[PDB]
């Protein structure tokens, strides 16, 4: 009894995703999904002769959903952290990263360091329930933290000037600044902290070992990096 | 109950090997075995105060044998793949590689790309039941695929002109072209895909963890890369 | 029941340490413990909202203590080896190293190789029950091996001239020669063999997987390498 076997038998892979996080997972205005981790999710399902079932979830509900067993694996640009390690397993990482700022191109110079950023006159905007929030709350003792529930729309807020910056994964900062010409990803090559992206798993060795092997291959074949770039340069809508 | 404990108690390590794959495993005309993975198998058995029992197997029978529990571990130049990951575990890899062609030196230019190779007038020869076959069947929609049961002899077939080329592990192509002066390993530095060599294991965490530790040391001590070379430059017979 | 869950519930982490091994673990004359692995042990306990309980142990008693389940993890400059792998698990390593000699500066030239060192007129001193002893017994067929129970005081013995040299971890040789001006760490850059430092764990996947994640982060954040140095340059007493 590994759910690897459950799945193989089933011919069905329940994959949890949020659909608010380009380029990993966006819910099209059709109602279907699209993104890197979705792409990758398909490939995984293919490799097990499983049909891809996509289960919607949200950062706030991720771990309730996990504990309720509402899915087999979570693929949605999920940052590895220990708070999560407490209940769930994690694949090997597929992306090294860390939090870095995105801001108005013009204003760039003013938001290079936490030091600058943690000032009373400053507003950081973040989406709720994930490492973005957790990281802001943990680090901003002086500035204001604005919580914007819809992550898709969140970056327009900066364009619109409703906030000064967001500190998110350097990859997302890279992407949004493509989609919002106004915005500028702040030293993404050199993020403020270190964290990884990996897929959230149940505590199931045999399954982890598989997912790892699968992912490890993809990585080393260059397929990972390849599809990664694809989805970055992909012609997304700007919000919805 | 890990078979680590079974083995330690026993003082006996059943190692499955094919004996058709120089330089990892060849069965001498004596009936004894020789090769890298054999060498390495001994070392493993030594490390557990176990006696080395060598179990013969064949690519076609590998996973039947595995499921029948006809052995403790398989050491035989075994390519990590997911089809296998479905039932069995794998050690950490001990070699990177990928499939590349071997052909008559003279004919080299004609077989540089899959593109060239997948032509109706072409015969690829492969040994049955393994990644070589699986890869050919997967990639040759136009050419003829000849299945030659004995992998030791298989390369003479090309020398003899019973086939145009074989696509195998770049390391084997490298070796055979040493042993069959006529044959020529095609851009081994740049193989058509990526795959690793590792040892096939049962789903036993404690045992994997041990094997890994062992192998990880060997690797990092330089013993791995050392013995590896040894067996490559070793003076093999040509077929039997 | 992973003891990860036992611990989280408990709010208590039993960490085994010897307190005889600067810079990883020394028992102060103030009574407390201090060292890198202690530091790191705290951090681990913090990360699980656990209180740090330190369990004393000794190399001779380490694996007895382990099998008796007298602790949750062992953090004490513990060399990964297979003899141990037989019963216990190990975290990912946090340090590469290998055995090298420490001796009177004056006498250095005489103890460069095992070759020199395994002479009938020579006395090697080692602390009992660990890789230092195991390595000496394994390698010194000709010389005399003196077993000194207290590892803190052991290096004075050489200063005092009760032995010619000790062969220990190049990091410890590096440290003692700072603390005993008389002594000199012999080509620490090039140790006689290879081994890693890691934390000894029970056979508990979920817990290993956590510890690893924790340690992996610490490593990659630079916190590992940072605190490491701290404790090396730290102003230790000389014995007690």
Cα(B215)–Cα(B93) distance, integer angstroms: 9
Identify the domain boundary among A168, A190, A212.
Answer: A190
**A105 and A92, same domain (yes or no):** no
- The structural domain count of chain C equals 2
Half-sphere exposure of C55 (CA within 13 A, CB side): 18
Give A-chain residues touching C217 at CB under 8 angstroms: 82, 194-195
- Of the candidates C37, C87, C239, the residue with the CA atom closest to the CA atom of residue C150: C239
How do strand A144-147 and strand A123-126 relate by DSSP bridges? parallel
Q: Are the CB atoms for A59 and A19 separated by under 8 Å?
A: no
- Of the candidates A23, A42, A1, the residue with the CA atom closest to the CA atom of residue A214: A42
**C33 and C123, same domain (yes or no):** no
Long-range contacts of A107-116 (CB under 8 A, 24+ apart): A107/A164, A107/A165, A108/A184, A108/A186, A111/A164, A111/A165, A111/A186, A112/A186, A112/A187, A114/A139, A114/A192
**A94 and A195, same domain (yes or no):** yes
In degrees, to the nearest 5, what angle opens at C-alpha C219 toward C-alphas C131 and A133?
150
Q: Are the CB atoms for B80 and B196 separated by under 8 Å?
A: yes
Cα(B183)–Cα(B174) distance, integer angstroms: 9
B159 to chain A nearest CA, in Å? 32
| Concatenated DSSP letters of B67-119 | HTT--SEE-SSPBP-HHHHTT-EEPPPSEEE-EEEEEEGGGGGGGSSHHHHS-
Q: Which residues are registered as beta bridge partners of A164?
A: none
Residues with Cβ < 8 Å from A170, sequence gap 6 or more?
A97, A98, A99, A100, A185, A188, A189, A191
Quick check: A221 contacting C, CB < 8 Å?
A: no
Cα(A34)–Cα(C235) distance, integer angstroms: 57
Give B-chain residues touching C203 at CB under 8 angstroms: 2, 205-206
Cα(A205)–Cα(C124) distance, integer angstroms: 45
Q: How far is CA C77 from CA B140, C46, C80, in A?
A: 55, 20, 9
**Domain of B24: which CATH number?**
3.40.190.10
- Return the residue in B194, B196, B205 with the most chain A beta carbons within 10 A, the one to mutate for interface testing: B194
- Of the candidates C5, C18, C87, the residue with the CA atom closest to the CA atom of residue C55: C18
**A174 and A202, same domain (yes or no):** no
DSSP assignment, residue C127? -
| Concatenated DSSP letters of chain B | --HHHHHHHHTEEEEEE-SEETTTEEE-TTS-EESHHHHHHHHHHHHTT-EEEEEE--TTTHHHHHHTT--SEE-SSPBP-HHHHTT-EEPPPSEEE-EEEEEEGGGGGGGSSHHHHS-TT-EEEE-TTSHHHHHHHHH-SSSEEEE-S-TTGGGHHHHTTS-SEEEEEHHHHHHHHHHSTTEEE--TTS-SS-EEE--EE-S-HHHHHHHHHHHHHHHHHTHHHHHHHHHHHS---S--
Cα(C226)–Cα(A104) distance, integer angstroms: 35
Chain breaks in chain B (C to N over 2.5 A) after: none
Two structure tokens written together for C37? 């692995």
Residues with Cβ < 8 Å from A164, sequence gap 6 or more?
A103, A104, A107, A111, A122, A123, A124, A158
Two structure tokens written together for C155? 């290096």
Quick check: C224 contacting A, CB < 8 Å?
A: no
Cα(C123)–Cα(C157) distance, integer angstroms: 11
**B141 and B87, same domain (yes or no):** no
| 3-state SS record for chain A | CCHHHHHHHHCEEEEEECCEECCCEEECCCCCEECHHHHHHHHHHHHCCCEEEEEECCCCCHHHHHHCCCCCEECCCCECCHHHHCCCEECCCCEEECEEEEEEHHHHHHHCCHHHHCCCCCEEEECCCCHHHHHHHHHCCCCEEEECCCCCHHHHHHHCCCCCEEEEEHHHHHHHHHHCCCEEECCCCCCCCCEEECCEECCCHHHHHHHHHHHHHHHHHCHHHHHHHHHHHCCCCCCC
A80, A90, A205 member nearest C205 (Cβ):
A205
Residue C157, classed as helix, strand or coil, is helix
Residues with Cβ < 8 Å from C12, sequence gap 6 or more?
C50, C51, C53
**A92 and A211, same domain (yes or no):** yes
Q: Are the CB atoms for B134 and B79 separated by under 8 Å?
A: no
Cα(A10)–Cα(A52) distance, integer angstroms: 11
Range 182-201 of B in CB contact (< 8 A) with A: 193-196
Identify the domain boundary among B150, B171, B190.
Answer: B190
Residue C127: domain span: 99-190
Give B-chain residues touching C85 at CB under 8 angstroms: 209-210, 213-214
Q: Are the CB atoms for B151 and B20 separated by under 8 Å?
A: yes
Residue C173, classed as helix, strand or coil, is helix
Asked whether the bond before C23 is cis by omega within 30 degrees of 0, the reply is yes
Q: How far is CA C91 from CA A148, A233, B16, C37, in A?
A: 40, 39, 29, 13
Give A-chain residues touching C8 at CB under 8 angstroms: 86
Number of CB atoms found within 10 A of residue C129's CB: 18
Cα(C20)–Cα(B179) distance, integer angstroms: 58
Q: How far is CA C153 from CA A101, B141, C21, C231, in A?
A: 53, 74, 11, 19
Cα(B35)–Cα(C133) distance, integer angstroms: 34
- Which helix (H) or strand (E) segment holds residue C114: the answer is helix C114-117
What are the two backbone dihedrals, phi and then psi, of residue B166, each rounded to the nearest 5 degrees? -125, 145
Two structure tokens written together for C49? 């909202």
Number of CB atoms found within 10 A of residue A70's CB: 16
**B204 and B94, same domain (yes or no):** yes
Residue C52, classed as helix, strand or coil, is strand
- Of the candidates B93, B76, B71, B79, the residue with the CA atom closest to the CA atom of residue B35: B76
Contact C4 A86 (CB under 8 A): yes
Identify the domain boundary among C168, C190, C212.
Answer: C190
**C18 and C85, same domain (yes or no):** yes
Two structure tokens written together for C123? 């006395």
Cα dihedral C28, C32, C36, C42, rounded to 10, equals 180
Residue C56, classed as helix, strand or coil, is strand
B210 φψ region: left (φ > 0), alpha (ψ -120 to 50), beta (else): alpha
Two structure tokens written together for A231? 């989805």
**B202 and B121, same domain (yes or no):** no
Cα(A216)–Cα(A93) distance, integer angstroms: 9
**B202 and B93, same domain (yes or no):** yes
Cα(B75)–Cα(B218) distance, integer angstroms: 15
Residues with Cβ < 8 Å from B172, sequence gap 6 or more?
B21, B22, B77, B102
Q: Are the CB atoms for C100 and C184 separated by under 8 Å?
A: no
Q: Which residue, chain included where needed, has tokens 């014995």?
A: C239
Q: Are the CB atoms for C220 and C103 separated by under 8 Å?
A: no
Residue C223, classed as helix, strand or coil, is helix
Return the beta strands (E) in C136-236 as ranges. Answer: 144-147, 165-169, 183-185, 195-197, 200-201
- Of the candidates A77, A51, A42, the residue with the CA atom closest to the CA atom of residue A62: A77
**B7 and B93, same domain (yes or no):** yes
Asked whether the bond before A217 is cis by omega within 30 degrees of 0, the reply is no
- Of the candidates C198, C199, C210, the residue with the CA atom closest to the CA atom of residue C2: C210
Half-sphere exposure of C35 (CA within 13 A, CB side): 23
Strand order from edge to edge, sheet including A200-201: A51-56, A12-17, A73-74, A200-201, A89-90
Half-sphere exposure of A42 (CA within 13 A, CB side): 9
What are the two backbone dihedrals, phi and then psi, of residue A56, each rounded to the nearest 5 degrees? -75, 145
Chain breaks in chain C (C to N over 2.5 A) after: none
Two structure tokens written together for B139? 């990639």
- Which helix (H) or strand (E) segment holds residue C125: the answer is strand C123-126
Q: Which residue, chain included where needed, has tokens 């013009």?
A: A106
**B73 and B163, same domain (yes or no):** no
B85, B195, B196 member nearest A210 (Cβ):
B85
Q: Which residues are registered as beta bridge partners of C13?
A: C52
Residue A107 CA from chain centroid, whole number: 26
Q: Are the CB atoms for C201 and C91 separated by under 8 Å?
A: yes
Cα dihedral B181, B182, B187, B191, rounded to 10, equals -90
Residues with Cβ < 8 Å from A128, sequence gap 6 or more?
A59, A60, A147, A148, A149
C2, C214, C221 member nearest A82 (Cβ):
C214
């Amino acid at each position: 009894e590994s759910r690897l076997d459950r799945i193989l038998e089933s011919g069905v892979l329940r994959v949890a995703t949020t659909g608010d996080y380009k380029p990993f997972s966006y819910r099209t205005e059709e109602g279907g999904y699209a993104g890197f981790d979705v792409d990758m999710a398909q490939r995984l399902a293919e490799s097990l002769g499983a049909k891809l079932v996509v289960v919607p979830t949200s950062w706030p509900n991720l771990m309730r959903d996990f504990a309720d067993d509402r899915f087999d694996i979570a693929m949605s640009g999920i940052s590895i952290n220990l708070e999560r390690q407490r209940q769930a397993y994690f694949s090997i990482p597929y992306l090294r990263d860390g939090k870095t700022p995105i801001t108005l191109c013009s204003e760039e110079a003013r938001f290079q360091t936490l030091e600058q950023i943690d000032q009373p006159g400053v507003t950081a905007i973040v989406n709720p329930g994930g490492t973005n929030e957790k990281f802001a709350r943990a680090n901003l003792k002086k500035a204001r933290i604005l919580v914007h529930p819809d992550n898709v729309t969140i970056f327009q807020q900066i364009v619109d000037g409703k906030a000064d910056l967001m500190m998110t994964d350097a990859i997302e900062a890279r992407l949004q600044s493509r989609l919002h010409p106004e915005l500028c990803a702040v030293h993404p090559q050199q993020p403020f902290d270190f964290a990884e992206k990996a897929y959230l798993l149940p505590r199931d060795e045999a399954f982890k070992r598989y997912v790892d092997q699968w992912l490890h291959i993809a990585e080393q074949s260059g397929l990972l990096r390849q599809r990664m770039e694809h989805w970055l340069e992909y012609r997304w809508p700007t919000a919805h």
